[PDB]
Amino acid sequence: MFLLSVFFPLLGGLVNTSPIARFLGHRGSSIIAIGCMVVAFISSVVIYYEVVFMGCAVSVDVFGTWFSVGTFHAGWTFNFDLLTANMLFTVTGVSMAVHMYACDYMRQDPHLNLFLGYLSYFTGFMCVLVAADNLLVMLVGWEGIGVCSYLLIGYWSHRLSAVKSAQKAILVNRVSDGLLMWGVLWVWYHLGSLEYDLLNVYSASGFVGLSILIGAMGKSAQILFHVWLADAMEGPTPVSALIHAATLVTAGVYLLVRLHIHDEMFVIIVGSLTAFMAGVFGATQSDLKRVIAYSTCSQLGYMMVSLGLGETGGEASMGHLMTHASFKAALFLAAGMVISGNGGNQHIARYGGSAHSAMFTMLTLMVASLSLIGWPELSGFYSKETILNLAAICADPIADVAHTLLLLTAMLTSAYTTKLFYQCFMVDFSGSSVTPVRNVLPILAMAILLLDIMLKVWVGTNLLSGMLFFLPWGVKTLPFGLMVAGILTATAAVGSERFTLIRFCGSRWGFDQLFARSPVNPIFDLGRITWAIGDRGLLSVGNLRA
Amino acid sequence: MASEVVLALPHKLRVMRMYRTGLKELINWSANRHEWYPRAYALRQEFEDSKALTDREEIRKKLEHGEELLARFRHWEPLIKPEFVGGTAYSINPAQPKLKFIPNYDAMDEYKKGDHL
Amino acid sequence: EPSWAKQLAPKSGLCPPEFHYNREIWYPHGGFYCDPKGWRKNTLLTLGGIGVLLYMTFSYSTANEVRHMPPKGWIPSIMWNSNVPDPVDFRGRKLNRDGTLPEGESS
């Protein structure tokens, strides 16, 4: 059962993209994709119960040695331990519902089986990433999900902005991939191996944690790397759900939790600044998918700070990752159903009422939104409150500012999520297209993720749930009051007259515009210099006329 | 200040474009359409208070000030219907143009299908 | 109409009638709204081949799984794998293969 969680989504992708799919068509390829995900989810459930609960890790030599020159030895080997089982359960369970949704959402697309094969490849490379036992097979998974993210973001290739969004995701992540590669070189040079179980670091040379942190900041879309994440909304809604829940953005946090070789000052500062920035960014957007994208960036900031706190903080970071994937995928699927019910419009000024959506879509948005804002005794309450209480008792003075930033971020999140519900359903109608979707497949796709939200409350992620870190009632129940403050403010729909702050925040602090000329235009101009002045000029040798 | 296109317009069409863009920017800055209706009424009453003017200098000063206001309050995220330019559904799955086909190209003039030297 | 146009597949019932897509192009994945006539039989045969691959990789995984620690209770891999060690619980006590405490401390 253990190799069935990794191979078999890759097999589904291989089937649906090869000339076998010429004989199946759309109708047969949908069956193949859904079955190939159901099998992998069943295998991951067995792996989860064996490794997490009964504590028996399994190591598999899959395809022998990859390459071995000198003392640099990379093998095709997996290891299934606690983190790997957690990640496999989360990835396969989310990707199954996203496949069941995409087989109905992209029904009218002309190349449906190609899209399903790309989704399966993306899932399989994520499984390869988390199942690897050494750094090089991890890099296979890293670049595989990067390539499949490029193929899926720029799926509608006749649209130029989608193509440029895919290229932007590739380039922004390529900077951090370079830094991560140099960090792998440092790690191997000063420890002698590439396998995770032999990488126990107490005191290393600083470049190790910094360069691995930069490589993780690329994929997890932290500060000065978040710019690709918002533009990745050019792709279809299943792509966004799988990018923001289970694949891609959770890979850097997984890598930092696995290695635990960071220096906590950088991690805490980057995470808290990212959380506050993405909180204020999502409060001032009107595109329905961009608000959810910025909430993803904000929660990744929370997890970054938590893994900065310590080993218990690393466990809480993995726990928040696991519970975040379910309600984030549910939020994106419900938003896709609302968009399709309103004629493709993504602006929240053109919604309202309870006619453009099913009852189940509204229930899904409500329950996932309540889990995200930390409503008591739902799924996100346990993990988010654990991170907040662990940040309130850290003995680092830097974590004092980080906790304040997290509390402000919590109020902002409960503001804009309540605004997303309020604009979508509570206000009067201001669109003109009412085509509500009530198909069986997307409704069952949403119901599965709501079942996982219930499961996280009933069965915890780890042993931290129910442990009491001893805090006064004032410190403990303040995030509930911040949630209520966000709800009351957003339902009052109040606004400020400070329009220059509004347009500074709504334009997202001008990061893209400043990047358009601080590295980008200089790279183009230095290329002009090296070609025209150097190759055609200073180094050019002419002819002798006679 | 207006762009080089709007500065080339006749005066009637210049004022009409200013009123139209003001209504659209009020749509962009509002939360809903039901928020937008009394702001649209107020903008209409604002233009009605300068209808009976004759002095071209006062007309020019009011026109230029309003164009400066519209350049200031240009929304960074305008509301565009999805299937038009700048919308989210523009240029996704267009019908293919007619592409020509050459049947059995390898079988035409075999043994002489390389590059000359 | 060209001579070779009679050999080509029509636009399928999934494709909108006003959509044009140059039917001469061979796409490796199937192309525009692919809907072959015998698709249910092909789907069943590909499901059978996938089941063959599933059995092959289940056998390979079972042959190559290494457990360096005994589990802390009964695991479902005991049913199909004979290399799974006997469970040793959280207190260090050796257990039976069905996951119960042996005689001397049971009931």
């Binding site: - | 049947p103 059995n104 190209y105 | 597949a9 001469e24 809907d35």
Partner: peptide
């Protein structure tokens, strides 16, 4: 869906494009 259901027959017979641009001449083998 054609036929009124997901589980009906397919609706395409013949070549779904020509591999390598090769068209059969008079039904002869290539």
């Amino acid at each position: 869906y054609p036929g009124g259901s997901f589980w009906s027959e397919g609706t395409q017979t013949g070549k779904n494009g020509f591999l390598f641009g090769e068209v059969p001449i008079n039904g002869q083998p290539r």
